[PDB]
Ligand binder design. Structure first.
Ligand SMILES: *[C@@H]1O[C@H](CO)[C@@H](O[C@@H]2O[C@H](CO)[C@@H](O[C@@H]3O[C@H](CO)[C@@H](O)[C@H](O[C@H]4O[C@H](CO)[C@@H](O)[C@H](O)[C@@H]4O)[C@@H]3O)[C@H](O)[C@H]2NC(C)=O)[C@H](O)[C@H]1NC(C)=O
Ligand SMILES: *[C@@H]1O[C@H](CO)[C@@H](O[C@@H]2O[C@H](CO)[C@@H](O[C@@H]3O[C@H](CO)[C@@H](O)[C@H](O[C@H]4O[C@H](CO)[C@@H](O)[C@H](O)[C@@H]4O)[C@@H]3O)[C@H](O)[C@H]2NC(C)=O)[C@H](O)[C@H]1NC(C)=O
Ligand SMILES: C=CC[C@H](NC(=O)N[C@@H](CCCCNC(=O)c1ccc(I)cc1)C(=O)O)C(=O)O
Ligand SMILES: C=CC[C@H](NC(=O)N[C@@H](CCCCNC(=O)c1ccc(I)cc1)C(=O)O)C(=O)O
Ligand SMILES: *[C@@H]1O[C@H](CO)[C@@H](O[C@@H]2O[C@H](CO)[C@@H](O)[C@H](O)[C@H]2NC(C)=O)[C@H](O)[C@H]1NC(C)=O
Ligand SMILES: *[C@@H]1O[C@H](CO)[C@@H](O[C@@H]2O[C@H](CO)[C@@H](O)[C@H](O)[C@H]2NC(C)=O)[C@H](O)[C@H]1NC(C)=O
Ligand SMILES: *[C@@H]1O[C@H](CO)[C@@H](O[C@@H]2O[C@H](CO)[C@@H](O)[C@H](O)[C@H]2NC(C)=O)[C@H](O)[C@H]1NC(C)=O
Ligand SMILES: *[C@@H]1O[C@H](CO)[C@@H](O[C@@H]2O[C@H](CO)[C@@H](O)[C@H](O)[C@H]2NC(C)=O)[C@H](O)[C@H]1NC(C)=O
Ligand SMILES: *[C@@H]1O[C@H](CO)[C@@H](O[C@@H]2O[C@H](CO)[C@@H](O)[C@H](O)[C@H]2NC(C)=O)[C@H](O)[C@H]1NC(C)=O
Ligand SMILES: *[C@@H]1O[C@H](CO)[C@@H](O[C@@H]2O[C@H](CO)[C@@H](O)[C@H](O)[C@H]2NC(C)=O)[C@H](O)[C@H]1NC(C)=O
Ligand SMILES: *[C@@H]1O[C@H](CO)[C@@H](O)[C@H](O)[C@H]1NC(C)=O
Ligand SMILES: *[C@@H]1O[C@H](CO)[C@@H](O)[C@H](O)[C@H]1NC(C)=O
Ligand SMILES: *[C@@H]1O[C@H](CO)[C@@H](O)[C@H](O)[C@H]1NC(C)=O
Ligand SMILES: *[C@@H]1O[C@H](CO)[C@@H](O)[C@H](O)[C@H]1NC(C)=O
Ligand SMILES: *[C@@H]1O[C@H](CO)[C@@H](O)[C@H](O)[C@H]1NC(C)=O
Ligand SMILES: *[C@@H]1O[C@H](CO)[C@@H](O)[C@H](O)[C@H]1NC(C)=O
Ligand SMILES: [Ca+2]
Ligand SMILES: [Ca+2]
Ligand SMILES: [Cl-]
Ligand SMILES: [Cl-]
Ligand SMILES: [Zn+2]
Ligand SMILES: [Zn+2]
Ligand SMILES: [Zn+2]
Ligand SMILES: [Zn+2]
Lengths: 694, 694
């Protein structure tokens, strides 16, 4: 028969391994010819696998590259002007790697050019709260300084933006072994740890959901009008460069000024972690000089889009997508997800050749230039927003399959919680000590919900990956799932080798998943979801799950506001309307669930499914959030302090953040009230899309 | 049987006459108790007629009223400060009208308060081109002057805005007999002409699609956050008052300064129509003083919403709506439309009681506060935008049924042209000399298309009535139809008694339509459309008609740009992309029409109908037009020079308007190119919603 189990069993660990190997032998940097070749290979294999159509969708987008003959680097410069120490120009490449000249050296994509010289200030992780600790408690001024920050905790582009707002003239980012060196494991190539010469690449955009910085709102197609560089959407305005911990130890060890405020400011290097500004005594005359010569250039990128037409509802789209472009070899990020996606397409194509079709249309995407700020997925979604708005059922992301081997990790809309729960109860746990047991049980045991026991943790979507435009801008239900580490604490840092040249096929095969069993599990979760979304007669969304979390979120934002009881009284700040809306939503959603069990008639079915599909859409505010016209979801947005994290009721949360330091409290609290009204009105409106239609 | 002819024949002239009489015996000003009583009467009668549900939807919106004990008026003041002439405080009420104290005196709704004194400048109709003629050819400066303008040609709120931008400190509006006195007919009550003491009321908002000036984007519900008056959306910033031609003759006759530039500046009064500034010689010391004491107040308004649930597609909505609030008695505007709407509901209720239901759901609306800037329809649409976006098939307006008795007048989306054509071929002409002939033939004979012969004229939708939010903001196909005069030239002026106290039941019954045959025709057109939209198996929209007009519009905007050939070369201004998009649209639309003839299967039908319904939606740009976030339709917007007129490719047209006077031509032409790209991308995107879905 042609059912989900047939689909799950066609997925093989060995095929995923063949694909991962094939996809990671050379670099696939966005905009390069090698990446275009891999696109043509995907396209032509997805045709062989059996898809109805497979096409390249190209865009000309702003990309960023180092200058091949004027390399980026940082110096310590002395009084006479002599460069007495220089950071490295490239990472020592991994063992057996031949075409070296083609490996992009470490750089921060989208840094402007510049040669600033100054005194160093160490800002910890450069989080909003680290800048508050520096300027407000220690009274240390960053204006005109170079800040050195460690990677981790928050998206690197937030760090750069915090440094800009504090007046810095440059940013050095580095990987501290506290965050990137798991005790008791060896450095690559003998272990999965970061060596001293390894360096994390990555864009430092001030992400705002726009996609190509030159064409916000519209696809970067052939006749596109482009903004000038000066009006470009999220480009940083100070030079930025990343280094490894050997180079960083050389910069940090001379530092003076004030002691670190406490030990959460210390990493593991053998240095005092002085905050600065400047070096101590003997070296107070030395300076740090950055040399950044990277260039911005409009470059062609290619998305592969495969279509598997639905038998019954070909005008309803379930999308499975992940990116193909990598910084270097992309051993984990993204080819461990791309390999899983290839095995899923192969498996759907098999059933297709035996005469089966999904009920709904499935779209498979291999996105380009995700590493440069989600450009391939975002341009495609701007091009097709009208089709996606009226037709998109769900989006499943498939970037990295693993990032550890301890347990499952899932972020998705509440509409998909019950789907995820049911699917994982029917899947085998691949974990040692859990054979015979379900994936749900191992997952629940190792990663418990902080709210309800007997349930696993599912997180909120923010930004940082290609689901972002589907979910935050268009309001299409979205989800992602991968295998992860035990280390809850480092959950936004990346694994040790994240974005460095050492992420290779050997890394995955020797240290992560020799049997490819974690990849197989992940393929089963992402394929299984896509299968159910695409084939279930009633869409597998449970609106009652949205009712439950809305009430946690409302309780939470109310709690944050109540740290200011006197202002709540003086300005009449009331959450009554928002609680009433969440109550109405709870009521209407449970009446709706009953009718959904209690109705054969294709029109009634299409109408109920349309209520389910459009329910996520109903949380979209067409005016967007304040100053953020492309963050339109009123319940979720990327956190303004950490684009990797989702924030709930983001409009109210931003109006409240640091509200005590607003100079006009009447106008600040007026803006909180406005956002309560917007959130209340939107919850009620969404609820009324689930009422009887007439 | 239960078909369209049964529906058409249940409509009776005599019922419309009973309703018109009932609806016009007392004033129904928005926000008054009398208007609320009429709402309760409508609601309870629509229940009797047979609707499934009828509810009041209330909002608290900014309204504007004169001060009952400090009346508005204008003076001529002498050097000593004595007011030597005063305009009247009320219009002489019509014969037999009892409750006088309750008739709102003439005022311009939303004028701020003020007592400016100054010299008069006469600005003709105060159109953009009249201000260009004054300041640019005659070199006359309006700054610090009171402008006196005649009503006509363009929406009064454009006049006030032109006067503000030119530096005026006040505006006097008046009705000139050239525009409001049809030669050879008597003044009311003996004819349908405006008497010397009659005065046109009306709002002077700077309309921008927002609805309630205090709550743009969101419904003015009970917990709404309101902007302060200072940030309010389209409120004028100078005092404005309307007068009749007796009072105006007194203001105009003393005027001096320069002669009128030509005769298109002269009305019919016995005065020289001098432009000013100031009076001649002997009276150069006299001044004009305005006394404006009107107040803005947040007032409750009530929409009546009736639902007739569909038998097969209850989640698809066809809306028939018109307003109920009037300035005074509303003899023509709006009760001649409301009476027709009541007769349509009665007729649908009759079939309903015999067991018939429409295939789609029908919604009937009696909107409030349309006269104060479309507030009832707009707030309701902000409240229900999510339901309307995903479910709205079409909106049919029903303000005034007649405004003359010569021939039919229709404005609608191209998607409805073929529907209008077919329906009117099946309707009788009520015109003398055309008995036995179809409404299409009389209409075509009296009002020919300027493009194709054998077809009648159909105009573009702008603003000025309650369809606006449905069409310009939400992209729901919209239409309107009424009986009109021969006078093509005065097509934006209103009929002579427009918005004055003389628009009464007797006016209509004695001078417009004694037999109520024109109202019956109009009921048949608006009911017929609603019937077809609601009951036809394939939605009666023809996308090939959109392809034809897009190409006229493209030719037209290209022509306007080509008055600047040298700049087109220097800045590489190319319309190639837009012509290619219109060509693709033509091609795809005709392939689509073929599949539409060549397909029983309910899902295939629902999918094709959804392509038709969403086709209007596909022209919506979620970013809106520049500075106009609520004008979102890329093909149509109200004209920036005349909110009553529709402009096609409004983004490009505004970027081009007066482009030679832009100080930075590079930046101005860069903005034209940007708009060509937006229009090209949107036509192509709309076209691709009609492709095979997969
Ligand atoms: C959640 O669902 C509930 C109930 O289903 C919904 O209730 C609505 O609440 C509003 C109040 O916010 C009610 O409004 C009232 O309506 C009546 C007429 O029906 C009016 O008489 C009332 O006005 C008087 O009272 C006001 C407040 O005291 C005065 O300011 C005003 O001047 C009047 O004197 C009042 O407007 C409305 O009837 C109900 N709807 C119902 C019961 O169906 C609630 O709003 C929903 N929550 C959210 C956040 O949407
Ligand atoms: C209306 O429909 C038509 C046809 O159905 C659609 O045609 C598209 O036009 C674009 C050009 O605007 C084509 O783009 C080309 O695609 C090929 C690969 O398929 C590339 O090789 C081309 O790039 C080269 O040429 C460029 C221009 O000379 C260079 O700048 C570039 O560096 C490359 O060397 C080029 O991008 C596209 O293939 C077709 N699509 C088709 C034929 O299906 C047209 O765009 C539609 N009109 C609108 C306004 O959308
Ligand atoms: C737009 C950003 C490009 C790029 N994106 C990217 O490198 N994404 C990785 C991020 C890895 C570290 C943080 N991890 C998470 O934020 C996370 C969220 C949900 C799940 I299930 C698992 C991890 C990525 O998303 O894989 C970057 O961050 O430089
Ligand atoms: C928001 C405006 C409120 C009010 N609206 C209003 O008074 N609308 C009337 C306008 C009558 C004169 C201009 N006529 C037209 O613009 C027109 C357009 C299409 C057709 I078919 C017929 C006439 C109204 O729309 O009836 C006003 O204009 O003061
Ligand atoms: C990855 O896999 C593909 C397909 O299995 C290999 O590409 C094929 O290579 C052979 C030999 O060059 C050709 O005959 C085919 O034209 C290719 N098939 C395609 C492009 O679909 C590819 O070379 C493998 N890559 C690596 C690095 O092993
Ligand atoms: C770091 O790199 C710089 C630049 O390549 C070195 O400084 C240059 O050295 C050569 C040879 O002494 C000079 O002729 C150049 O003019 C120097 N350039 C600059 C910009 O200073 C520097 O010697 C290196 N430092 C170390 C410690 O290796
Ligand atoms: C996940 O599984 C549960 C339990 O099997 C599903 O809930 C049941 O669904 C059937 C079919 O409608 C009902 O008749 C049972 O009463 C439900 N049991 C419950 C709610 O405890 C649930 O619907 C599934 N969720 C999906 C597929 O989204
Ligand atoms: C307009 O028509 C309605 C209904 O035909 C009249 O209202 C009814 O009046 C009688 C006598 O007051 C009452 O018994 C009913 O309660 C009313 N029906 C309603 C409100 O639905 C109304 O009075 C007429 N108005 C005028 C001005 O003639
Ligand atoms: C126009 O109206 C004004 C205001 O009502 C008249 O001026 C007032 O007249 C009385 C009696 O003479 C004075 O005591 C007031 O102080 C005057 N008020 C103002 C504001 O001037 C004026 O007389 C009227 N003019 C005409 C020609 O009727
Ligand atoms: C208006 O009437 C025309 C002519 O009757 C309709 O066009 C015909 O429709 C039938 C049914 O699909 C076709 O088979 C004929 O070939 C059509 N004749 C033509 C195009 O000349 C037209 O569809 C009607 N338009 C509506 C209801 O929107
Ligand atoms: C790279 O190096 C130098 C910098 O001036 C020069 O040869 C070239 O312009 C640079 N390459 C660029 C800007 O693409
Ligand atoms: C800090 O930095 C510079 C010193 O040059 C100064 O201009 C700026 O105002 C200072 N701000 C604070 C809060 O000290
Ligand atoms: C894989 O799991 C094993 C067993 O716990 C362990 O040796 C290793 O640390 C894991 N690999 C990674 C990359 O975490
Ligand atoms: C109307 O007239 C006077 C103006 O000061 C006063 O009695 C009253 O405030 C006014 N009414 C208003 C402002 O509603
Ligand atoms: C016109 O009006 C005033 C005169 O007071 C002046 O300030 C303004 O600049 C003038 N503009 C022109 C174009 O004459
Ligand atoms: C109604 O039509 C007749 C005949 O042409 C004419 O007397 C009259 O002017 C018309 N009424 C109006 C209001 O135009
Ligand atoms: Ca773009
Ligand atoms: Ca509003
Ligand atoms: Cl992922
Ligand atoms: Cl109308
Ligand atoms: Zn990735
Ligand atoms: Zn990455
Ligand atoms: Zn009206
Ligand atoms: Zn009106």
């Amino acid at each position: 028969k042609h059912n989900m189990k047939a689909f799950l069993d066609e997925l093989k660990a060995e095929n995923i391994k063949k694909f991962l190997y094939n996809f990671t032998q050379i670099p696939h940097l966005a905009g390069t010819e090698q990446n275009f070749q891999l696109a043509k290979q995907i396209q032509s294999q997805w045709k062989e696998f059996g898809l109805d159509s497979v096409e390249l969708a190209h865009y000309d987008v702003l990309l960023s590259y180092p200058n091949k003959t004027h390399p980026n680097y940082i110096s310590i410069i002395n009084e006479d002007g002599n460069e007495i120490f220089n950071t490295s120009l490239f990472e020592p490449p991994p063992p057996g790697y031949e075409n070296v000249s083609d490996i992009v050296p470490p750089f921060s994509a989208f840094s402007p050019q510049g040669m600033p010289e100054g005194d160093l200030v160490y800002v910890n992780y450069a989080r909003t709260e680290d800048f508050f600790k520096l300027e407000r408690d220690m009274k240390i001024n960053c204006s005109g300084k170079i800040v050195i920050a460690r990677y981790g905790k928050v998206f690197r582009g937030n760090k750069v933006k915090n440094a800009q707002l504090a007046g810095a003239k440059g940013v050095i980012l580095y990987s501290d072994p506290a965050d990137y060196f798991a005790p008791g494991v060896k450095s690559y190539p003998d272990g999965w740890n970061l060596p001293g010469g390894g360096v994390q690449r990555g864009n430092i955009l001030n992400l705002n959901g726009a996609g190509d910085p030159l064409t916000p709102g519209y696809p970067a197609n052939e006749y596109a009008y482009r903004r000038g560089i000066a009006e470009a959407v999220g480009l940083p305005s100070i030079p930025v460069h990343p280094i490894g911990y050997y180079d960083a130890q050389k910069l940090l060890e001379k530092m003076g000024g004030s002691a670190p405020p406490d030990s959460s400011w210390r990493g593991s290097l053998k240095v005092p972690y002085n905050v600065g500004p400047g070096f101590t005594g003997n070296f107070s005359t030395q300076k740090v000089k950055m040399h950044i010569h990277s260039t911005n250039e409009v470059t062609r990128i290619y998305n592969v889009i495969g279509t598997l037409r639905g038998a019954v509802e070909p005008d309803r789209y379930v999308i499975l997508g992940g990116h193909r472009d990598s910084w270097v070899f992309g051993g984990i990020d993204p080819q461990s997800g791309a390999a899983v996606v290839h095995e899923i397409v192969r498996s759907f194509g098999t059933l297709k050749k035996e005469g089966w079709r999904p009920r709904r249309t499935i779209l498979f995407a291999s996105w380009d230039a995700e590493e440069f700020g989600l450009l391939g997925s975002t341009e495609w979604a701007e091009e097709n927003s009208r089709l996606l708005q009226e037709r998109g059922v769900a989006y499943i992301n498939a970037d990295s399959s693993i990032e550890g081997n301890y347990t499952l990790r899932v972020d998705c809309t509440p509409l998909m919680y019950s789907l995820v729960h049911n699917l994982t109860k029917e899947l085998k746990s691949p974990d040692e000590g859990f054979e015979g047991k379900s994936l749900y049980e191992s997952w629940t045991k190792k990663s418990p919900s902080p709210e309800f026991s007997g349930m696993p943790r599912i997180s909120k979507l923010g930004s940082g990956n290609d689901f972002e435009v589907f979910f935050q801008r268009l309001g299409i239900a979205s989800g992602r799932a991968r295998y992860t580490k035990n280390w809850e604490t480092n959950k936004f840092s990346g694994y040790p080798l994240y974005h460095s040249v050492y992420e290779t096929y050997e890394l995955v095969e020797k240290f992560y998943d020799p049997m490819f069993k974690y990849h197989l599990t992940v393929a089963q979760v992402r394929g299984g979801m896509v299968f159910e979304l695409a084939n279930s007669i009633v869409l597998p969304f449970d609106c009652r799950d949205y009712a439950v979390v809305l009430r946690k979120y409302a309780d939470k934002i109310y709690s944050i506001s109540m740290k200011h009881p006197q202002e709540m009284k003086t300005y009449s700040v009331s959450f009554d309307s928002l609680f009433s809306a969440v109550k109405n939503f709870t009521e209407i959603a449970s009446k709706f669930s009953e009718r959904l069990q209690d109705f054969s008639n294709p029109i009634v079915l299409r109408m109920m499914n349309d209520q389910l599909m459009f329910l996520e859409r109903a949380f979209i505010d067409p005016l967007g959030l304040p100053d953020r016209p492309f963050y339109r979801h009123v319940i979720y947005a990327p956190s303004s302090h950490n684009k990797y994290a989702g924030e709930s009721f983001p409009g109210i949360y931003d109006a409240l953040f640091d509200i005590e330091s607003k100079v006009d409290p009447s106008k600040a609290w007026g803006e909180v009230k406005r956002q309560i009204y917007v959130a209340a009105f939107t919850v009620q409106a969404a609820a009324e899309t689930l009422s009887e239609v007439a």
